[PDB]
Amino acid sequence: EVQLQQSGPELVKPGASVKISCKASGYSFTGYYMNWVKQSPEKSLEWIGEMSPSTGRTTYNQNFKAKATLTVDQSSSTAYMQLKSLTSEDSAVYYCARSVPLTTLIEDWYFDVWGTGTTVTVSSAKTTPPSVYPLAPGSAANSMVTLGCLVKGYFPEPVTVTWNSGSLSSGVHTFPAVLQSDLYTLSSSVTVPSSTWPSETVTCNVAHPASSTKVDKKIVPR
Amino acid sequence: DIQMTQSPASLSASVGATVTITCRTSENIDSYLAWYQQRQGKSPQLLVYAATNLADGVPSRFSGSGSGTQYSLKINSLQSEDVARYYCQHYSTTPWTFGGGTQLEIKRADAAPTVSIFPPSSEQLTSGGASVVCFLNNFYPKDINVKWKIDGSERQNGVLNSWTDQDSKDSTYSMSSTLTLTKDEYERHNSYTCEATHKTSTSPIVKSFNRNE
């Protein structure tokens, strides 16, 4: 029931600013503190600061005092965080997180509900759409066959991949993207019974929201 | 800033095992401590607060203990859904800080990789590029090393590798390795080899194709 819907992924230039949103549902929004946490690519967690949605009152981690500003909109049950003068250090996933009610005498300051997360990328690298390449065998008739898609030369993350519009999900391995020279490569493999391919259609579907692109690639033999 | 040091960095145990993760603090934090779980690709969830209080809805196989500068999270009868990173956090004096995390994996029986290799697509060759891809799927343990050989000579430049996280059904790992060349250098050669070392084979695992043969 309690949910914290955050805003979408961001690509920002190494001088600019960004404002992240956190929409609350299933509880009295102004009744509980709201916190913000950074998660570096190295998967370390850093507490940025806390805001009271009720009184506007605020406490910062001094390391973020120059970087972060926390704001509120009570009418829409939404908390905000702006990050100023961004550098590579600021590329991270940012979470909003609910703590205890404002009426607690108890000394328990835990984060009991975490937001959906907002991935922030800061770089001067250009948004580039993916090339999608089919991976098919040249062996004819194993009882299982492995097919794949190679998604190359795109920026920024994320790309998402499905097989047969998500209806083919068992035996799929979609691999983490690897950055080289400001462009990503990702691959995905799918293993199917050899009785079903090539007699039946297998297609990888690739989405790259940043560049407004969706690609379908049917895997054909040879 | 209170330093929070977790150990071990990585833990591997069988389904049904009891496991303990430790969090050591730079100050007596008087049990003002929380534990969180975070599964791959997901937001963290609260497990334990005040060092020993189980958060509601959390499975009872989880427990916390500690005092002074040493705190522990314990999982009785480890389950495959417990594969995740675990973090401790203090709330004693500002600023609140977190440990570096502990990653838990399920220990299972050794599993040999299923290896598939793919020449460049005709589509890519039209761009003047050529990627050869090797999949090494559903193996255990995670430790693997991949080398590329072209006409028998090891090639290191232009190789990109990535690993999946542990599979929630079968507890294996998979790996992908892509060697990218130019269409021109790709066409100067015949034999393309993906070669792996893994504990399930005494000798190197060799997967090749001949361009073309």
Residue numbers in the entry:
A (entry chain H): 1 to 141, 144 to 224
B (entry chain L): 1 to 213
Which of the paper's sentences describe this entry?
Acetylcholinesterase (AChE, EC 3.1.1.7) terminates cholinergic neurotransmission by rapidly catalyzing hydrolysis of the neurotransmitter, acetylcholine, at neuronal and neuromuscular synapses. The target sites of three of them, raised against the Electrophorus electricus AChE (EeAChE) subunit and named Elec403, Elec408 and Elec410, were identified using complementary binding, inhibition and mutagenesis approaches. Inhibition of the residual activity of the Elec403 complex by the positively charged organophosphate inhibitor, echothiophate, and the transition state analog, TMTFA, occurs at lower rates than inhibition of the unbound enzyme, while for the Elec410 complex only inhibition by TMTFA is reduced, and for the Elec408 complex both inhibition rates are unaltered. These features, along with delineation of the respective binding surfaces using mutagenesis of EeAChE, led to conclude that Elec403 and Elec410 are directed toward distinct but overlapping epitopes located at the enzyme PAS, whereas Elec408 targets a distinct regulatory site located in the BDR, and triggers a new inhibition mechanism.
The combining site is formed by the six CDRs emerging from the Fab variable domains. As a result, the ~1000 Å2 surface defined by the CDRs is mostly populated by anionic side chains. This electronegative patch confers on the Fab408 molecule a clear anisotropic distribution of surface charges with a moderate dipole moment of 484 Debyes and a vector oriented toward the H-chain N-terminus, opposite to the CDRs. At the center of the Fab408 combining site, the interface between the VH and VL domains forms a small pocket of 10-12 Å diameter lined by side chains from the protruding CDR-H2 and CDR-H3 and the shorter CDR-L3. On one side of the Fab408 pocket, the long and flexible CDR-H3, which encompasses a Glu-Asp-Trp-Tyr tetrapeptide (i.e. four of the six signature residues above defined) and a net negative charge, appears as a suitable candidate for interaction with the BDR of EeAChE.
